[PDB]
Amino acid sequence: VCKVCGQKAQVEMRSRGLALCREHYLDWFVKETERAIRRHRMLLPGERVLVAVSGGKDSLALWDVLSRLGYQAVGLHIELGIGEYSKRSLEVTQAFARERGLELLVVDLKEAYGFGVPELARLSGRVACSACGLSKRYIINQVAVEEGFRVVATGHNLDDEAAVLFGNLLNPQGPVLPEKPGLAARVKPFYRFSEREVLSYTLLRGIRYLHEECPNAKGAKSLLYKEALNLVERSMPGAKLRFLDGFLLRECERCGYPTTGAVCAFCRMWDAVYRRAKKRKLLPEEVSFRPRVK
Amino acid sequence: VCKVCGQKAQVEMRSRGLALCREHYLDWFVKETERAIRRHRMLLPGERVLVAVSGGKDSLALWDVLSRLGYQAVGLHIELGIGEYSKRSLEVTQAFARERGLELLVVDLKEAYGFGVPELARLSGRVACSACGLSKRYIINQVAVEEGFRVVATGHNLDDEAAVLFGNLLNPQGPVLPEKPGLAARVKPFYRFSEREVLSYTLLRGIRYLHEECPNAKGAKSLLYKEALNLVERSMPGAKLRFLDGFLLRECERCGYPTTGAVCAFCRMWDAVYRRAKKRKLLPEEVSFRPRVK
Ligand code: SF4
Ligand code: SF4
Ligand SMILES: [Zn+2]
Ligand SMILES: [Zn+2]
Ligand SMILES: [Zn+2]
Ligand SMILES: [Zn+2]
């Protein structure tokens, strides 16, 4: 029975030994989010915040909640140029913002830099997710800083932090990443939430999100870790949360942004990519890579 | 191809990127065992050692190797009184010692204490494995000390240590446990070995072991952890070993053996068991529990 009203429970959280009807689950989820924000001084009451929005359940849900709590939540979507996948992601995301009258910023990777994640992978030599991850972190930050956002929110959740933690133990982040001179802050307001929890909010709130996952991968290390931890969690609710809980610079020559070297990894990657595009005659020889500067 | 001779490989160890024919796998396993013994000063050349032998693959294999290396390896088996299971375990174990002319010590739990692990569980209030585990640790030690063994060896392996480590991270031991006044030392010479590795040695050496597992459990926490870690290991060989590696008193009033209280957990358990047997008229009222003393 629902713990708040005593009518039919629509969501059960064995992790928390808690059951709620639709309305009170939705109420709890939102309130629990505002709790994380306050417990870690993540945001200011109506603060502008740049939300990294993929079109997936977590980031749409997050965009949804932060609005509800009255923050000025601007979304940033990055069209990564991964085929129909990147196309659908953008569509969904745009559909979402359109319906809610939220403002959406979009960076199209091929229009801005000349190559989509696939060609970027082939040319940089990195695995697609390495190139892609690096490209996502850089551009979100740059967009943030360029547009005056003190802070940036991602929809990373309990499953993510625990999977990451587990990955490190096998192969040797905090709710708030502190603002620095060339770095906006990164808050994860869904850090305590289960994936199943976020998915529940998303379904009960009627949010249409992109069900398709990205073609690669499909061999993700993160996925392997999540299965193994879910296999445990199923039989031992609260395992992930216990696990987690238990445990707890220079300016780039090309672009001005923070790095521990002369040239940042991002500039270093697009530099080489451009160089090799030239050698293979894909770019004119007199073209160079000019990153936007701080 | 086998790394030592170049003929057909019979065992592959992706964990180690190593392949060996039967003869050279057997040679490697034995030599790797003698390595663990020396690297951690576990044993002396012909030292007497009490081997906890269940009749399973690990302890028979271990009993086999320690003999081969010329240690005086006496086995200890505990008939725990768990139905046909405890019966078969004893048979297998006896068959093994008989064929190799090794000496086997046996403690039958019902003959010594009056109850088998099942009744022991019901009467102590503990889950069978809690009563059983406590009973096994106590009796092995007592037998060791009573018989003048400085040291005791168990067949616990990499899978076991990693499963245990994982269990603690979710729900908050060393190769050598140091001899103390009332405690013989405990060496695990198979601590670096995979389960699959030990099983391989066992099969290639032609050792007949007890394939049946114990009726409870069948819900083991240790089992859950091992699956989840194997699920990872399959896709990422060396995960367990990385995981592991990365990370790295008073006398009892009744019985004289070490404890952190007045009466040790073992004496405390059999005491209550006897008391409740009396109340239920299963023991005469004038009978008391007299544990053997140091
Ligand atoms: S999966 Fe790899 S490639 Fe596909 S989006 Fe996430 S990171 Fe970029
Ligand atoms: S499983 Fe539980 S009960 Fe069966 S033997 Fe191992 S410990 Fe004793
Ligand atoms: Zn309710
Ligand atoms: Zn740079
Ligand atoms: Zn060989
Ligand atoms: Zn005692």
Q: Is B54 annotated as a binding residue?
A: yes
| Amino acid, single-letter form, for residue B166 | F
Tell me if residue B106 falls in helix, strand or coil. strand
Residue B103, judged by CB atoms within 10 A of its CB (0-12, 13-18, 19+), counts as: exposed
Bridge partner residues of A12 (DSSP): A19
Strands B72-79 and B104-108, how do they pair?
Answer: parallel
Distance CA B72, CA B63 (A): 10
Chain B residue with the nearest C-alpha to that of A229: B228
> In a 3-state reduction of DSSP, which class is residue A37?
helix
CB B57 within 8 A of CB B207: yes
Which of A203, A173, A192 is closest to A16 using CA atoms?
A192
Name the CATH superfamily for A1-294: HUPs (3.40.50.620)
The one-character DSSP state at B142 is: H
Q: B264: annotated binding-site residue? A: yes
Helix segments in chain A, DSSP class H: 22-39, 57-68, 83-100, 109-113, 117-124, 128-147, 158-170, 195-204, 221-235, 239-247, 265-279
Report the distance separating Cα B12 and Cα B30, nearest Å.
16
Cα dihedral B184, B220, A166, A122 in deg (nearest 10): 120
- Chain B residues within 8 A (CB-CB) of chain A? 169-172, 221, 224-225, 227-229, 231-232, 235-236, 239, 242-243, 246-247
User: Two tokens at A96?
Assistant: 């979402």
Query: Which resolution in angstroms does this entry have?
Result: 2.8
Q: Which helix (H) or strand (E) holds A105?
A: strand A104-108
Amino acid (one-letter) located at B21 = C
Neighbours of A273 (CB within 10 A): 25
Dist. CA B271–CA B265, nearest whole Å: 10
How is residue B96 written in tokens?
A: 């093994």
CB of A78 within 6 A of ligand 1: the answer is no
Other beta carbons less than 10 A from residue B252's beta carbon:
21
Q: Compute the CA torsion angle B182, B183, B184, B190 (nearest 10 deg).
A: 180
Q: Do A236 and B170 touch (CB under 8 A)?
A: yes
Q: First vs last Cα of chain B: how many Å apart?
A: 55
* Spatial distance between the Cα atoms of B191 and B211, rounded to a whole number of angstroms: 21
Nearest CA to A212 out of A113, A108, A86 is that of A86
Distance from C-alpha of B11 to C-alpha of B1, rounded to nearest angstrom? 10
Nearest chain B residue to A172 by CA distance is: B246
Q: Look at residues B129, B41, B91, B66 and name the one whose alpha carbon lies nearest to residue B210.
A: B91
Contact between A207 and A61 under an 8 Å Cβ cutoff? The reply is yes
Structural element, H or E, at residue B108: strand B104-108
For residue A280, give both structure tokens: 């293979």
Task: Using CB atoms, pick whichever of B172, B229, B235 lies closest to residue A246.
Answer: B172
Residue A105: count other Cβ atoms within 10 Å of its Cβ.
17
Instruction: Please state the separation of Cα A77 from the chain's center in Å.
Output: 10
Is the C-beta atom of A214 inside 6 A of ligand 1?
yes
CA torsion sign for B284, B285, B288, B289 is: positive
The amino acid sitting at A57 is K
Domains of chain B, by residue range, sit at 1-294
Measured distance CA(B76)–CA(B147) in Å, rounded: 11
In degrees and rounded to multiples of 5, residue B2 shows phi and psi of: -65, 135
